[PDB]
């Protein structure tokens, strides 16, 4: 004999599956706008270096 | 680096404590063995604040266990993530109160204080820079008011620089539980006014209403209701484990939202909350958020904030956003309803920004509300007390353990001076 | 008697003001040392 | 010729965190500290191949300091230069100026000795905060007067940050402002003023941001103090220094808080629309809707006012572009002061940094001037101050972290002087 | 010194018969964090 | 080298001992059975100190037993590590002493401390360099605190310059097994107060209380007991069988522990000691250890040193660790409670350091220290004495074997001044 | 060139316990009064080397004076100075001025006549007092009345410990205090204010001890005094002696109540940490934290100021931190007055006793003022005497001793002129 005290609770209460960010695509804002500068290629227009 | 000591009584106290540092601990990505298992690195520079590494990875909670009778113990180490609690922090007494503020607050506590003191000292001098207390516990009880609140009273005068935080659940109209309610609801006020720092009022029938309109569910049992006060208790403090935008800890939010030393009773809620059916509406923005926010349906506390005008407030947002956006909406909220609002203090509303959202949300805010609409739970609880305590009914279980009348008259006479100072400043 | 030890601070004093002077004339040859130097490999 | 910069608060090592990016993009110095003799004023030459920042990153809150320890730059900064404290001051001015205060500013005050020993052709100091919390004013405040006692002939440009009239994220930081002020008017040497309303409209606006945050404006900070020292920076037409803005900016010991303009403030796609020149962008540096502060120069009289030119710029241009100005009756200058303008140009153009908005332009004019309407600004803030010291809000934590109500009372009193003194020049 | 011995018997007990549980709840727990962690996938960058 | 050799004696003593010979053989390791069978080289160079060599690896231990009953020898040989010890060490009386010390110290002691004088003088003379003797015994039983004392004044004839330490455990009133115990506990600390070089007082309460609150223990025999006291006794002589970064031998440690000779009563603690149940949730640092040596309820004597003054103090450290801390935690502790400390003598605490920490363990600890909180047991005893010698209760087996009433009289009064120098110097 | 002292009730006399061992240590005098013309000021060489302070020891009761009977300085003091009486005034103005002071006065009088009957330059005198007390209160006012009527030209240094407003230690002071001033206000003619609560954050803040007991503010008060009586026991490079007192820090007749200050006050290890000037010093004379009395200067405006210094000290640099000061704007003086300073140079600088809270610090700074807030501090004392004199509490016992209402309102009256005087001067 058993109760109810078991449960998941965190599908019942807070979750969007939908909008879940992923635990690995954390950042802190500072972290996405200060990339390298040599490498940055998280941006699609950019000025490319012209020799 | 801040460090933040928990303290739980009572069996809500254990039941939502238990709660709380199973959010915390999905939060940090450890699974209930005691050891880190998340991916973002993210959780490992701010786990100090909650957990001691002791071996092999095995990061112990920095809380304290308080009760009376065994069941609430053992349904706290019966579920998961309770064989990650210390044993030694489960100090422990054996007769239990029941119902009593004076047998939990002379003749118990007496023997149990003691232990329940050294525990917290050894835990307290464990870690360098001691930010402050953080408690939650019940009212209505004998075990987590009266002892709690003694427990209160002795780390308030050692300790009289560190901060005080309560999570305390307030006697409710409807839903009226036991029978004493007032007696000791008005005694744990009388010596909260006076020794805590700031006071989160909590209450069970704003949980429950809220499990009907928001989440529509069908049988909300005590589960979801203390994942939600636990939501909320780590939504305050997400400050001090993330990085952010513009950081505010405890300090912060205290000095933005008490004006006078007696001006520290608020009142909470959390976004977003919608039904598993309605999970596509809702886009997570900042105005949605915010008209969430700041709904009376979304209040957990049984006091309309149309019946009174807003002192002070605080929004703790998390996740990546504008704030722009955020300003933007804070003071369309001011200037729109500007009725509900105290005139002479401008920008009433407190913000912070946080980077990191909850596991399972995209962003999330956290409300912070001193209203002087509270002063109407107060008076609810004092017409009570005086229709019973006018002809002493249930009075003979309370002096016969030391106490007089004049505690009575004590706290009665200090909690109308109260609800005095919050229709003054109305 | 009475401005000996005022007598003290004022030699202390003189003496501290000509070694800072000094060391400012040092500085001086020093920068345009460098300068002769750095416009050369620039010539 | 050399100058050291400070950063106090969440605010201002933020800005110096784009403000050295900004830096080391522009004399081409990759992020770990060396090249793939214009550098000399800002990166300390080190062994071989490596330069080092004259500056200081000092707050409360070790977080966002040690975020930054832990960011892009990590080899690029000095570890001892980021200083750190173990706890926050909490939106206090008495909290950072008097209990924690006091035992960090010697540390700081240490490192600023030896990183100015180090240093031979120093021009002055150069200072990052915001006034609207606790962390940033009050020992920002101790540190200058400290400094003010150590040096004090070495100038100190002042970049604040005040609580904006609507919008607004604390509730009282109308104490620390005020109590900011007064300090700040006896230590500060010329003071600029910096908003952030202002340059939201200004991003929502030119750059047609919808949803900008603080690092969009603190790249255009950058922007700005890269234009105002590119001319000790680097070679141009006609050179000035550090000595340039008190001499030609300050009339009165108190009367030093400025104005500032940036032009052309526009997008990468808009650069293909318009044909930039010196005169529309010497004409856009002036409009209301092209300055960092939010006030109306128009209810308010200009007295002296200074030009940086950056780019392909002949001196013809700047003449008749000022000239046109001056003719303008729209504007009004002072009979007063005469003459009212300083020029400045260098030759290399605005830089540009990967992922920002702003487009590479030819040529830019950073505009920074002294008016009246900051008397304006300072009794609309005495409004709302007065306004809610009747009540006797908030005062208690201020009494008991070690202060008094008296010099709120003082620096009030301050204030109403400066708004005399103000209204008593602007006649 | 009785009432103190069969504290310590019942306390040395019921930490033994509570471990048990909890080693016996913990499975199912983990199985419903799996199942509501498969509905969200990473991202690749 | 310098060589340790061991006397036990009584019950008490050879239980002990068989347990210390065991913890000691397992630190060497030598199997049951006598051979070496160890893996490091620093297992080999210093075991002369306890062992000799006999042939083909097998080393025998330098110890000599002593009781007046076969019950304890035979207990001693049928268990474990019994068959290493040496058979004609086991100098073996006949009739017993039970419970009276007339007869261990005058009767039984005259026809057998000639053979253990014979065994001991023996095996000395075999060693090259003694550095001193070592003898546990009991004050409550007859073979071991009459005999034993009659031995130990013997050896202190025989050989003076050597050192000896003393293990003697001293019945309490609240753990009480003998009627006559006051009887032979006196006499016996009458004759170790001039004998004896150094004492460490050992009580069986003090331990029972150790194995209840620490390990959380439910049936504490005396194997537990014996192995606490074993740990302890092996912790003492830790330098002089491994390197460290500062040795101390055993008169490095008297001479920084006893600046009057007369006071040399030690009360002693070890740590680390944990539940198994609590053994993962602890970290294992230096604070960890200096915390708990130092807590009055870790002592392994029935004396409160918070009642008195902590007059000198010494510690003994086991592990690869790091000097800095130990000397910030020693000079933390001096400072924080000064009123435990005398006056007259500052920096009273002595440290030593050996980075081999004991099997199963990366970091222990060992505290000697020199109160003047040691003459509450004392008092504690005569007061006993006094009230049962005023009515010559039992003294008709005592005067009936040539003692007389003048070595009593003597007896408290050696009891007396030791008592009150010891109050003096408080 | 000679001064004599005199003690009354149990704070003017512990004040002297402590000034005159301050005093023998300064000039190496042991306590049994042997040297192993500076002194000459203070002691009268008797005999064959000794020395006999001008001094005399009066109290009430006689415990305070047995003590000092059977302490360590026995042959220092004659014994026959040394007047005890036989039973206290009880903190009872009308007892002490009319029981018991009626046969003590007269002995206290043909002791003083001889006394200075001995000195032959005698300058003047100075008392040492607390009004708040009975005896200190009732028979000293009689006293030096006695005195008045006795000398009339003669100057006298009425050294005051008034009560503070918060903090006290009776109940009935307040009644003493006016009492006193009734006297006080037209007897004297220099006044100086003590008092408690004061000291207690001087020595709470600066000097950083939380367990302070009465010896350290004798300690500190003793030095304030040897400071202020070292420019007439040693030559200094610009010396003042007591006459210029009143005819430079009193403006008026009637107002004669001027504040105490010290400066550096420093524990001994805060003078390892900074090496001092002048400037800093100078400043810090002038601050509140550092003043010796309840007020807020800030609120009033200055009459005149008095400032002597010791130790090492030239006149240029004082007279450049006179000028720093008067163009500063935080304090500001009467329109009547153009300058209101006094400045003061000795040699010799401050001494340290042994087992004292003091530092051996190069030069000090003693600050000496006169402003309006010392009205304001007489209208919160007389608010709080007339709030208990409403109900005629505790008068009736004064009434039994032979008083009755009209001296109390009278001294009611004078108060409320002297307020109306302090306002109207003020203008
Ligand atoms: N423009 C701009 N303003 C900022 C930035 N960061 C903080 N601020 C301003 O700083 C004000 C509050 O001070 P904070 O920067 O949060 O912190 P603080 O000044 O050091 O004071 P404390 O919070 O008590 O530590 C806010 O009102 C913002 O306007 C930023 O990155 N850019
Ligand atoms: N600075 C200082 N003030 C003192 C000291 N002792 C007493 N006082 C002050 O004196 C006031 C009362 O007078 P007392 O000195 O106690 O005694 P008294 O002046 O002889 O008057 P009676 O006690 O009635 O005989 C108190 O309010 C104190 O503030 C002291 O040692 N130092
Ligand atoms: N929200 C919430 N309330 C709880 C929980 N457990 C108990 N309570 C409330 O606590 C009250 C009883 O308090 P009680 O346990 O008797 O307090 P104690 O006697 O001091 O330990 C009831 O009215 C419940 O509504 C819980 O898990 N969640
Ligand atoms: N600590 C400890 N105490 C013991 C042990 N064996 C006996 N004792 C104590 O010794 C006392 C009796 O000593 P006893 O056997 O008469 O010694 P003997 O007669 O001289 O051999 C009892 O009170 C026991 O508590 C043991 O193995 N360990
Ligand atoms: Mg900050
Ligand atoms: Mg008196």
């Not at chain 2, 009665?412 to 100072?421: A, I």
């Amino acid at each position: 004999s058993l109760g109810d005290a078991l449960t998941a609770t965190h599908p019942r209460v807070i979750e969007h599956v939908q909008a879940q960010t992923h635990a690995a695509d954390w950042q802190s804002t500072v972290q996405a706008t200060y990339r390298p500068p040599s490498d940055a290629t998280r941006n699609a227009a950019a000025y490319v270096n012209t020799s | 680096m801040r460090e933040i000591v928990h303290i739980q009584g009572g069996q809500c106290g254990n039941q939502i404590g238990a709660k709380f540092w199973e959010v915390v601990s999905d939060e940090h990505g450890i699974d209930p063995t005691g050891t880190y298992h998340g991916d973002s690195d993210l959780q490992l520079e701010r786990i100090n604040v909650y957990f001691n590494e002791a071996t092999g990875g095995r990061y112990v909670p920095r809380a304290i266990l308080m009760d009376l009778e065994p069941g609430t113990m053992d349904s706290v180490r019966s579920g998961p993530y309770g064989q990650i609690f210390r044993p030694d922090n489960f100090v422990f007494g054996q007769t239990g109160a029941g119902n009593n503020w004076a047998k939990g607050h002379y003749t118990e506590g007496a023997e149990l204080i003691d232990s329940v003191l050294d525990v917290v000292r050894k835990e307290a001098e464990s870690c360098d820079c001691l930010q402050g207390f953080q408690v939650c516990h019940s009212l209505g009880g004998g075990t987590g008011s009266g002892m709690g609140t003694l427990l209160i009273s002795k780390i308030r005068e050692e300790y009289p620089d560190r901060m005080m935080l309560t999570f305390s659940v307030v006697p409710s109209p409807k839903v009226s539980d036991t029978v004493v309610e007032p007696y000791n609801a008005t005694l744990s006020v009388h010596q909260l006014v006076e020794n805590a720092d700031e006071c989160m009022v909590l209450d069970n029938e704003a949980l429950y209403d809220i499990c009907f309109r928001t989440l529509k569910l069908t049988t909300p049992t005590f589960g979801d209701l203390n994942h939600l006060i636990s939501a909320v208790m780590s939504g305050i403090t997400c400050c001090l484990r993330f990085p952010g935008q513009l950081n505010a800890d405890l300090r912060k939010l205290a000095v933005n939202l008490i004006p006078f030393p007696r001006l520290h009773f608020f009142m909470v809620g959390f976004t977003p909350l919608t039904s598993r059916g309605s999970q596509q509406y809702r886009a997570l923005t900042v105005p949605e958020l915010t008209q969430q926010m700041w709904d009376a349906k979304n209040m957990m506390c049984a006091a309309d904030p149309r019946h009174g005008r807003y002192l002070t407030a605080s929004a703790l947002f998390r996740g990546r956003m504008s704030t722009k956006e955020v300003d933007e909406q804070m003071l369309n909220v001011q200037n729109k309803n500007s009725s509900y609002f105290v005139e002479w203090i401008p920008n009433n509303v407190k913000s912070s920004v946080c980077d990191i959202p909850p596991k399972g949300l995209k962003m999330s805010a956290t409300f912070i509300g001193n209203s002087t609409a509270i002063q109407e739970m107060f008076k609810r609880v004092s017409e009570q007390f005086t229709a019973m305590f006018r002809r002493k009914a249930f009075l003979h279980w309370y002096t016969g353990e030391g106490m007089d009348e004049m505690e009575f008259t004590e706290a009665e006479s200090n909690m109308n001076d109260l609800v005095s100072e919050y229709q003054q400043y109305q | 008697p009475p401005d000996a030890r005022i007598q003290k601070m004022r030699e202390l004093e003189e003496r501290l003001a000509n070694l800072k002077a000094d060391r400012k004339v040092e500085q001086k040859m020093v920068a345009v040392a460098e300068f002769e130097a750095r416009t050369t490999k620039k010539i | 010729r050399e100058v050291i910069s400070i950063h106090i608060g969440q605010a201002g090592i933020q800005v110096g965190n784009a403000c050295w990016e900004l830096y080391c993009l522009e004399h081409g110095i990759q992020p770990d500290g060396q090249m793939p003799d214009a550098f000399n004023t800002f990166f300390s030459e080190t062994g071989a191949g490596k330069h080092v920042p004259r500056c200081i990153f000092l707050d409360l809150e070790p977080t966002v300091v040690d975020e930054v320890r832990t960011g892009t730059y990590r080899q690029l900064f000095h570890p001892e230069q980021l200083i750190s404290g173990k706890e926050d001051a909490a939106n206090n001015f008495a909290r950072g100026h008097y209990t924690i205060g006091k035992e960090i500013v010697d540390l700081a005050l240490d490192r600023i000795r030896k990183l100015a020993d180090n240093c031979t052709g120093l021009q002055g100091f150069l200072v990052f905060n915001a006034v609207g919390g606790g962390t940033g004013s009050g020992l920002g405040s101790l540190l200058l007067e400290r400094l003010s006692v150590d040096y004090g002939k070495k100038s100190k440009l002042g970049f604040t940050v005040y609580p904006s009239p609507q919008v607004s994220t604390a509730v009282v930081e109308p104490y620390n402002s005020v109590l900011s002020t007064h300090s700040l008017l006896e230590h500060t040497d010329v003071a600029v003023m910096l908003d952030n309303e202002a340059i939201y409209d200004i991003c929502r606006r030119s750059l047609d941001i919808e949803r900008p945050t603080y690092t969009n404006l603190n790249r255009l900070i950058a922007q700005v103090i890269s234009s105002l020292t590119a001319s000790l920076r680097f070679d141009g037409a006609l050179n000035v220094d550090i000595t340039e803005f008190q001499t030609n900016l300050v009339p009165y010991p108190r009367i030093h808080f400025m104005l500032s303009s940036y032009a052309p403030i526009i997008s990468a796609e808009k650069a293909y629309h318009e044909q930039l020149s010196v005169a529309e962008i010497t004409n856009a540096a002036f409009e209301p809707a092209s300055m960092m502060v939010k006030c109306d120069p128009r209810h308010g009289k200009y007295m002296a006012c200074c030009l940086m030119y950056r780019g392909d710029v002949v001196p013809k241009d700047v003449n008749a572009s000022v000239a046109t100005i001056k003719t303008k009756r729209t504007i009004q200058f002072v009979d007063w002061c005469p003459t009212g303008f300083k020029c400045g140009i260098n030759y290399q153009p605005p830089t540009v940094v990967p992922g920002g908005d702003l487009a590479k332009v030819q040529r830019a004019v950073c505009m920074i001037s002294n008016s009246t309407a900051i008397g304006e600004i300072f009794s609309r803030l005495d409004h709302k101050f007065d306004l809610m010291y009747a009540k006797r809000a908030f005062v208690h934590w201020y009494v008991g972290e070690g202060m008094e109500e008296g010099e709120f009372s003082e620096a009030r009193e301050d204030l109403a002087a400066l708004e005399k003194d103000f209204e008593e020049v602007g006649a | 010194i009785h009432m103190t011995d069969g504290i310590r018997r019942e306390t040395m007990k019921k930490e033994t018969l509570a471990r048990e549980r909890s080693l016996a709840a913990q499975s199912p727990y983990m199985a419903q964090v799996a199942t509501y962690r498969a509905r969200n996938p990473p991202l690749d960058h």
